[PDB]
Design a protein around this ligand. Sequence first.
Ligand SMILES: Cc1cn([C@H]2C[C@@H](OP(=O)(O)O)[C@@H](COP(=O)(O)O)O2)c(=O)[nH]c1=O
Ligand SMILES: [Ca+2]
Length: 129
Amino acid sequence: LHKEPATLIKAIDGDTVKLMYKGQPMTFRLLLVDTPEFNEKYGPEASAFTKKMVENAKKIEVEFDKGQRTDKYGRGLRYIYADGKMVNEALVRQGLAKVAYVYKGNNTHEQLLRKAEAQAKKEKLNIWS
Ligand SMILES: Cc1cn([C@H]2C[C@@H](OP(=O)(O)O)[C@@H](COP(=O)(O)O)O2)c(=O)[nH]c1=O
Ligand SMILES: [Ca+2]
C-alpha cells in the first residue's frame, strides 16, 4: 500500500472530505469506518474531529487499497493521513467512528482499526457511551 499527495479543498463530515488529487477536486470517503451523519448523535463531534485533523495538517496523503478505489457515488475510497496520522484509525480510536463496510478484499487495515475500536469500546468513549 502506497501513499499519494493531496490538498485539502474542504472538510465535509466525519468520514468524507473534498481533496485536490492529481489536479482534480474529488470527494473522498474513508475506508473501513462509519461516522454518524451530522444529524445523528456524535455526528457534529465526528465532523468536528475530522475537520480539525485535516485542516490543522500541513501534509495530507491518500492511500487506496487492493480493491475498489472509487465507490458507486464517485467517491475516492482511501485511508487518509494527516501529517502521517491516519484519520480513519483516529476517529475509531476516539469512539467517533465504528469499524464498518469491510469488504474483501479492500480491508488491508481492518485488524489495526478493530484493534483501535476494542480500546475505544473498553474506554467507553463517545459512541460507546
Ligand atoms: C465505506 C464504503 C462505502 N461504500 C458505499 C456503500 C453505500 O451504502 P448504500 O448503498 O447504503 O448507499 C454508501 C454508504 O456510505 P455513507 O456512510 O457515506 O452513506 O457507501 C462502498 O461501496 N464502499 C466502501 O468502502
Ligand atoms: Ca457515515
